[PDB]
Design a protein around this ligand. Structure first.
Ligand SMILES: CS(=O)(=O)N1CCC(NC(=O)N[C@]23C[C@H]4C[C@H](C[C@H](C4)C2)C3)CC1
Ligand SMILES: CS(=O)(=O)N1CCC(NC(=O)N[C@]23C[C@H]4C[C@H](C[C@H](C4)C2)C3)CC1
Lengths: 546, 546
């Protein structure tokens, strides 16, 4: 029967509670016990704190009224307050020490995932201090995980007034016996109980979660490590920049701080970075995730030569110019990773830092044609199949659902043999017509790619392979250079095409290269090991690109 | 006959030249004259500097080769180099001291405006130093004003090789006698002259501009103060955020740094901030210029109550949440300025700083209905005309060209009487059917607004006036508050509706309010006095919001 869960911010979603810091201050300053808590509630509903929680006055307006209540309290207590005493300093440190109670948020997320409506109901103030950004940042991180956020100062009502609980029930569109309410202050539970709601008194997190487990029948404690937050296409800010008359690039944008540009591979989308976008934004970066030329909502001209590296790199520079960005950190994967090494070799001033996932930097061989180096590697046989225009397109567009289900699989779930693709006459000749769904992706995630490739097709994406000779001549101009800006190479142990050993001589060209290695990871790195990728990127960004 | 003008970067568009700093270093370190310039050119076409300018090696790779050339030069000169000597320190300071030669750029802009094709042809390097952002920032500011930017290190050719001048002519699609070429190095002029191009040797800027004046027949020196750079709609990054199921907000974005949100008035567009967008981005800010709800590419629902202040403010907060911005500086004008005061009163944690142009903060009167305060002011008579749905829409949509030409006029060019609008039965009853074009706007600029209002109409925009009672009740909740975050009020001397005297008691509610005043400025502040507005905003942002 339970279908909604309500949490308080202070003392349940964020720790430690403000009241906890008032008691710690009394002890530290050798003040009479309870003195600061008495001044805090001085007057009850008529008092300064009630006016503050109702939104009648701001936090900066309340500070001198609280200072006064401390003096009036100390005169009756026959005590002398120190000359260092400042309500502002006490509150600045208390508000700043508060951090998200990770196990409580994890439990809220699990309940929402299992069908629950979740909400935060808190007694809070209008913060106009010079340090108010810390609070804004906290609320933003939390509000994306809950259906509703009800703040006292916005609705003009406070807990424990009975009107605020009636307002909650009408917002949730639920009966009181369908709601669980968690709060660390007993007085605030009193009216929730009178109405018939299930209440949990939060003293410690573990005991509170055990009570929540019993009452919901869902496992919350000792649960496996959850996947990172993935973003929703319809909730993203969508950007469109025209880089040249017939070419418009589409990107998705989130966050503030140094710009980080994400470049997907074949046959993918901006959506392939869904697990990295919210994490990098939360770490302090402005993320721009591209739909590369030939894909999704970006232009897809039919001409082969529109997809040679030289053209693709020039358009990326124009993209930064039109956005008004002098520099960006470039992070690529697969074909995108190849592009970012060439952005660092040809436009170092525009690249703050460079990172590639799976794709190594391979210098061009001036003594051997690229088509003969391709024939030397039997794993790269499929690249010869991709050369004839129309051939690979017809097979890949014949059944879009089959194409993405056959490709997006973990390394143990493989269903294709990359050698003798030309002999066999196709990539899916020895493959099932209806392949099983991989453990990496959901049906809905596969359907997103199917929708994007129904508009564009495979001509644009396949043309990235039809410029071997043009790319070879252009890359031969950089054989005397070294990459001397911050660089990161991330290898994937189980990528059977882009094997880790292909990157072993990279230190000859990038002397101060930083490395990362991911075990049991296949070709589709971002969605195969999302937490590992996020950890490696954030650690490197904070040190080499700040 | 002249139709193209080519400029060099070092020593002509940017001062001082690198070579000038080499001579100053020799003098400062008591080194033999010419020693540093000899090491710089050691080897000629075989030398390290030629390989650097051709893109064969990067700047960081050239530094130790130049250091070596300095030692080989000092051994023959029988001199001892100091133990402080560092080519890296010398070049870091030289590159950093270089600033745009404002009169030269102004002259280039004037020529382009008069039909010329303009270009930069420079011998430059691939800069991979830790300080390379200074150079990237410089090139970005310059490249937006020129048709082509040809850099030696990108084309593999250097000046004075004859092949680079032939490459220039084919890019410009022009005959040599149709081109003017400016350079500070005589040797680089030599091949331009052999081909038949008009050449100007730059020793000092003033003499160079006088030569350029004689040869083009256009006045460049002693010319009036130009208007700030205005942006082109088709070159902007266009953003779309869905804030609620039926409502999508459109914005234009440029720059990097702290976020600045621009909010236009009635009946305007994001385009009303065209002169402020490039200036604020150049000052170090990330500018987001909104199409407010009811206008342009933003949603325009027909319901009146979708345009009350409470709804408009909540959507602005959702806009920041979806973009991943904890805070933004809010700058409004007219109806937008009213909105930003309410964003600071109701959501201070999300507002880094607040500024209003023309619109004062007016607290609600709890003893008087807003419709009776409106009747007390005869200038606000037109607000009663706007109340009946359909009435003002039909008159304003009857002739879109007439509407924007009648409204967008300077204070001396006024063509409407705001009193007895209801008696007369319309805003344009005593107005000409074909009004003259104002000095503030071009025909093309008027046509941009006509195109935007052809899609949307005037229902949405007029609905912002049809919530007097709802806005009054909501604002009565803030009568106990004070605005205690950084605030700026900018008054316009000749605004006959929003008169400066309407803001005189603002210090009672915003004690530390900063003020700005613009003389001879009417209602349309941004486009009436663009340079003054930019100056006032940038000075305030750099001090109160950094
Ligand atoms: C030029 S490169 O060596 O940097 N190059 C190699 C091939 C790579 N991409 C690639 O071919 N990946 C796929 C990904 C799956 C699996 C297999 C076949 C098909 C679908 C293409 C390899 C891009 C970069
Ligand atoms: C509620 S307020 O006092 O902040 N309010 C007053 C009116 C103002 N805007 C306004 O009415 N401006 C116009 C601009 C031109 C000139 C005249 C008539 C018409 C076209 C509207 C005033 C918006 C803010």
């Amino acid at each position: 029967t339970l279908r909604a869960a309500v949490f308080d911010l202070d003392g349940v979603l964020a720790l430690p509670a403000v009241f906890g810091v008032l008691g710690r201050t009394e002890e530290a300053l050798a003040l009479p016990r309870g003195l600061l808590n008495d001044a805090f509630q001085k007057g009850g509903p008529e008092g300064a704190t009630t006016r503050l929680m109702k939104g009648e006055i701001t936090l900066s307006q309340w500070i001198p009224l609280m200072e006064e209540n401390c003096r009036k309290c100390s005169e009756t207590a026959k005590v002398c307050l120190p000359k260092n005493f400042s309500i502002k300093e006490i509150f600045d440190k208390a508000i700043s020490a508060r951090k998200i109670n990770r196990p409580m948020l994890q439990a809220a997320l699990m309940l929402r995932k299992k069908g629950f409506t979740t909400a935060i109901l808190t007694n809070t103030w209008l913060d106009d201090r010079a340090e108010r950004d810390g609070l804004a940042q906290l609320m933003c991180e939390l509000k994306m995980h809950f259906d509703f956020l009800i703040e006292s100062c916005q609705v003009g009502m406070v807990k424990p007034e009975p009107q605020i609980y009636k307002f909650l029930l009408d917002t949730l569109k639920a009966s009181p016996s369908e709601v669980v309410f968690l709060d660390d202050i007993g007085a605030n539970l009193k009216p929730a109980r009178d109405l018939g709601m299930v209440t949990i008194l939060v003293q410690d997190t573990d005991t509170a979660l055990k009570e929540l487990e019993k009452v919901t029948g869902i496992q919350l404690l000792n649960t496996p490590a959850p996947l990172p937050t993935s973003c929703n296409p319809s909730d993203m800010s969508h950007g469109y920049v025209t880089v040249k008359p017939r070419v418009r690039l589409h990107f998705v944008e989130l966050g503030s701080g140094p710009a980080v540009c994400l470049c997907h591979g074949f046959p993918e989308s901006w959506y392939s970075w869904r697990y990295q976008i919210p994490a990098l934004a939360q770490a302090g970066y402005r993320v721009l995730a591209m739909d590369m030329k030939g894909y999704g909502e970006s232009s897809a001209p039919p001409e082969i030569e529109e997809y040679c590296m030289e053209v693709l790199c020039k358009e990326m520079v124009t993209f930064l110019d039109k956005l008004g960005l002098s520099q960006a950190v470039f992070i690529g994967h697969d074909w995108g990773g190849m592009l970012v090494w060439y952005m660092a070799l040809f436009y170092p001033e525009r690249v703050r830092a460079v990172a590639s996932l799976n794709t190594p930097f391979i210098p061009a061989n001036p003594n051997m044609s690229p088509l003969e180096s391709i024939k030397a590697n039997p794993v790269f046989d499929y690249q010869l199949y991709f050369q004839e225009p129309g051939v690979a397109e017809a097979e890949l567009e014949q059944n879009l659902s089959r194409t993405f289900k056959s490709l997006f699989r973990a390394s143990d779930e493989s269903v294709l043999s990359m050698h003798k693709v030309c002999e066999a006459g196709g990539l899916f000749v020895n493959s099932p017509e209806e392949p099983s769904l991989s453990r990496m992706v959901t049906e809905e995630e596969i359907q997103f790619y199917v929708q994007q490739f129904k508009k564009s097709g495979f001509r644009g994406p396949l043309n990235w392979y039809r410029n071997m000779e043009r790319n070879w001549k252009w890359a031969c101009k950089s054989l005397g250079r070294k990459i001397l800006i911050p660089a990161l190479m991330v290898t994937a142990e189980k990528d059977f095409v882009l094997v880790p050993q292909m990157s072993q001589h990279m230190e000859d060209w990038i002397p101060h290269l930083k490395r990362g290695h991911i075990e049991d990871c296949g070709h589709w790195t971002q969605m195969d090991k999302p937490t590992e990728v996020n950890q490696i990127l954030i650690k490197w960004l904070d040190s080499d690109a700040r």
